[PDB]
Enzyme design. Structure first.
Site, short mmCIF file in Angstrom:
data_model
loop_
_atom_site.label_atom_id
_atom_site.label_comp_id
_atom_site.label_asym_id
_atom_site.label_seq_id
_atom_site.Cartn_x
_atom_site.Cartn_y
_atom_site.Cartn_z
CG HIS A 41 -5.16 -2.91 -0.53
ND1 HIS A 41 -4.36 -2.66 -1.64
CD2 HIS A 41 -4.72 -2.09 0.45
CE1 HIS A 41 -3.47 -1.73 -1.32
NE2 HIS A 41 -3.66 -1.37 -0.06
CB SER A 76 -1.02 -0.03 1.12
OG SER A 76 -2.17 0.77 0.95
CD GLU A 95 -4.51 -4.33 -5.18
OE1 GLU A 95 -4.64 -4.34 -3.93
OE2 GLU A 95 -3.42 -4.61 -5.72
#
EC number: 3.1.1.7
Lengths: 539, 539
Positions: free
Chosen positions: A443, A199, A330
């Site tokens: 994610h 991230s 995601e």
């Protein structure tokens, strides 16, 4: 034990001997890398930790930097696992080191990890970032530091001396200069520094590549699920300012109808209890949204000389080895946090109107026409109301817009400029995953594997997952030492080809052996990376 | 022979006995249906042919209406086959009739054919519109009339008494009222009139459905490769005027700096040699383009009360049976006529820049942004320069924009309003086709089959083609009698389902048996029919 006793450039340290399934590991947790950025230091670039007397204890994990804590689903592993597991504190600039027991023979390559959490949360102290397996098993010297997130890390009044921005990045750079001048003593090679994060950590790694001064401190780079160039990892000076002062104002800084003194403003801000700031963190965003964060790196024209877009567009990356990739879904995770109709508790089979609204939350910067464009693109015109489709569509708008297309825009830009790039698509949903099936591979759910958590038998993954993990660890450490995730010389069956402008090759990282593919969402990403922008700049 | 001698509402006629492969056919070629629209009649609504004395000879094909003649590839069958095969003349309002020899027993269903040629060219006299096989074999009473094309058919100065527009359509309507009051005498059923045409004839059939007064003269309708609603089959009053006067002016009408007398203008125009008009026909288009015609039906607020779009959008078609379809590559043919890089003589593997330009010729009304949208949509971003792809892309932009999506927009609008619609995709490339392989199945290459030309052994198609033809003829005549192209009661294997909003079913008309499919270019047509327009109306 001299294994656990190490002299660093500023003093002595005592590690602790950890036990990984395949053996012992040396672990030096809590190393101050800088002077606590408290008090009149808040908002300031970090300073090198002063040298200490005696033997600094380093047998334990330090305090998590000051940050918002996730409520939403209290007691739920899926969210909690991301939350701080140490005490909050502005005094948090420490790093960690894991080395195999006993210290390697010769200069092992180092894997410096950068945690991610929207630039607003996160900590090396976390369970999934346990560097013991990668040191134990692949005999790597692993390092994970803490960097200031939120206002403390990024609140900025561009041009100011006292809150100039990007200090959370300078924190990481400082940890890097420390690894440089001291990893040696842990058996690490200061000459084979491979940064790697997910991230915003990925986004961060990206910024190091984009930032000159970070250059000399690392040689290879990995960026998982995140880049420096998308819609959410940077803001302009103007917006930065706009959110600094607005945040200040909500906190009573400055009091009254005062003004025009950035210094007084920051001075004032410097007196508010940390939690007062965190309290208004989320009120400075300019629109209702998701995958958008208040305090994050700013394009100051210092740490970043120009936007990441312009930079990856004209930078010379002719030598850089970079591994890059993305997960199956995601966008899923982010939908629960704000898109009406979604929840982790039901199948979130949304209505069309819901989906129409989602699109505006998920693409907050979009004008109407641009929103229309997005709806056109993700609607299935043979079934424009199938809830299941709508549902998955929403997740794709978000995931493609913020992570995938930006990854692909970077992969290609890099390759085209000289980089040797490799790409992948993590598609294995952990068996243990506590989120609903509908989010598939959310994610951040590759981390457990790269770090090697399935190797721990208590944790109970599947043997496949275990083997899988080992495979993954192997690719990373291999990209780490060589700059090619590939089986040594040992051309062991499936090969991973460099992502290239022309062929556009990437691989399926999953239970079944490598399976090369071409074009990462090629159409879709052409939509986003090529057309959408001109639409937006017209509207 | 009383078979060849028929009394019509205005006089006697003598047909001729034609020999089709399966037998004899009665054929009444050249029946005046109206008073020649010459002299002071030019530009005027047609008038009913006066009754004649004696026995009108009707053993032969009359004069083709006045029209441009295709040069481009002189002596080439592919283009020539479309050219006039009779003498040109403003005196051309005749129709034809084919009836099986001997006259049917009972009221057979009638198939009235409407030729197409951009509204600027065309003739029932043509070889591929030989109604002998469909009468011979399927025992149908077939009729094909001539209607004024070009300036003569459509030049209009909206609101004027003497050049009010759409007179070429009134020609067809008049032929229809004649079939009504006289087809009876040829053994035809005035109660089962099925209109059927291709290109602008299809567009025409469409206008009859959209026009009240044409309603009572037909019961079923077929529209091949063309509709009343796209970008090229109608113009507004304003543009009509703009092209009338501009054309007039180039021809010296009116001479000098005169004006404001539409009557004088038309009076003046009425004196110019027919070819003088045809000479300037192509100079009144407002942009460089393809699949765009100068003189065509105008939205006068009479023959069409409002645009075809608005009409198919709110019309009540709740009972109408309509067969509709399209060919594999509509757009191909048109590329040779004006898109740099294309020719029938080479493989036309175009450059990207060529393709970029093509897009502006092929979508002349498009603003830049809209053009961008189209390029985005048809470019293959994994190979944005593959000439072969570009080539086929160009053909699709044209074919989808003008024929396919408009067909689909009509199919759906019809179905949604009550119509029973059926749809298809002709995919068989005639073996005899003289165009290059790259054009695949060009606009208009289904006609040979529907008409049954392969049944003629001299012509030499393949037995499959022959059988194929028979199958096709069967579907048409069946839709003609029943209103369902399907094997009678005789549920003979593959079935053809009605096109529906929800399922969106259509069938593959080709050598292999029926093969139902769903969604006619669904995404692509969503692009064109739903989004593109708003883009255009924004720009």
């Amino acid at each position: 034990d001299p294994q656990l006793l190490v002299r660093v450039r500023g003093g002595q340290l005592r590690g602790i001997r950890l036990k990984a399934p395949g053996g012992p590991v040396s672990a030096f947790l809590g190393i101050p890398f800088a002077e606590p950025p408290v008090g009149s230091r808040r908002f300031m670039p970090p300073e090198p930790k002063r040298p200490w007397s005696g033997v600094l204890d380093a047998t334990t994990f330090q305090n998590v930097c000051y940050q918002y804590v996730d409520t939403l689903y209290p007691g739920f592993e899926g969210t909690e696992m991301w939350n701080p597991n140490r005490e909050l504190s502005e005094d948090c600039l420490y790093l960690n080191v894991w080395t195999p027991y006993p210290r390697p023979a010769s200069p092992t390559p180092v894997l410096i990890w950068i945690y991610g959490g929207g630039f607003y949360s996160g900590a090396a102290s976390l369970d999934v970032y346990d560097g013991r397996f990668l040191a134990q098993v692949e005999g790597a010297v692993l390092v994970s530091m803490n960097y200031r997130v939120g206002t403390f890390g990024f609140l900025a009044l561009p041009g100011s001396r006292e809150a100039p921005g990007n200090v959370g990045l300078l924190d990481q750079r400082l940890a890097l200069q420390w690894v440089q001048e001291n990893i040696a003593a842990f058996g690490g090679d200061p000459m084979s520094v491979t940064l790697f994060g997910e991230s915003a950590g990925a986004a961060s790694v990206g910024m190091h590549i984009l930032s000159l001064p970070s250059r000399s401190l690392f040689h290879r780079a990995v960026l998982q699920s995140g880049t420096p160039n998308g819609p959410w990892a940077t803001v302009s000076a103007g917006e930065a300012r706009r959110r600094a002062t607005l945040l200040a104002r909500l906190v009573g800084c400055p009091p009254g109808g005062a003004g025009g003194n950035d210094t007084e403003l920051i001075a004032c801000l410097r007196t508010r209890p940390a939690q007062d700031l965190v309290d208004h963190e989320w009120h400075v965003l300019p629109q209702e949204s998701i995958f958008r964060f208040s305090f994050v790196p700013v394009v100051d024209g210092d740490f970043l000389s120009d936007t990441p877009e312009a930079l990856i567009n004209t930078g010379d990356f002719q030598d850089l080895q970079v591994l890059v990739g993305v997960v199956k879904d995601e966008g899923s995770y982010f939908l629960v946090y704000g898109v009406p109709g979604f929840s982790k508790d039901n199948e979130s089979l949304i209505s069309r109107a819901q989906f129409l609204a989602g699109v505006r939350i998920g693409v907050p910067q979009a004008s109407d026409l641009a929103a229309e464009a997005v709806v056109l693109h993700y609607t299935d015109w043979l079934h424009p109301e199938d809830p299941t489709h709508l549902r998955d569509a929403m997740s794709a708008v978000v995931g493609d817009h913020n992570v995938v297309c930006p990854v692909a825009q970077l992969a290609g830009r890099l390759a085209a400029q000289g980089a040797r790039v490799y790409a992948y698509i993590f598609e294995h949903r952990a068996s243990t995953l506590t989120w609903p099936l509908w989010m598939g591979v959310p994610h951040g759910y590759e981390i457990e594997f790269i770090f090697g958590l399935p190797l721990d038998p208590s944790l109970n993954y599947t043997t496949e997952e275990r083997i899988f993990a080992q495979r993954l660890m192997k690719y990373w450490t291999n990209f780490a030492r060589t700059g090619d995730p590939n089986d040594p010389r040992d051309s062991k069956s499936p090969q991973w080809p460099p992502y290239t402008t022309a062929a556009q090759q990437y691989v399926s990282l999953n239970l079944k052996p490598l399976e090369v593919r071409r074009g990462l969402r090629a159409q879709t990403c052409a939509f986003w990376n090529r057309f959408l922008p001109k639409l937006l700049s017209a509207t």
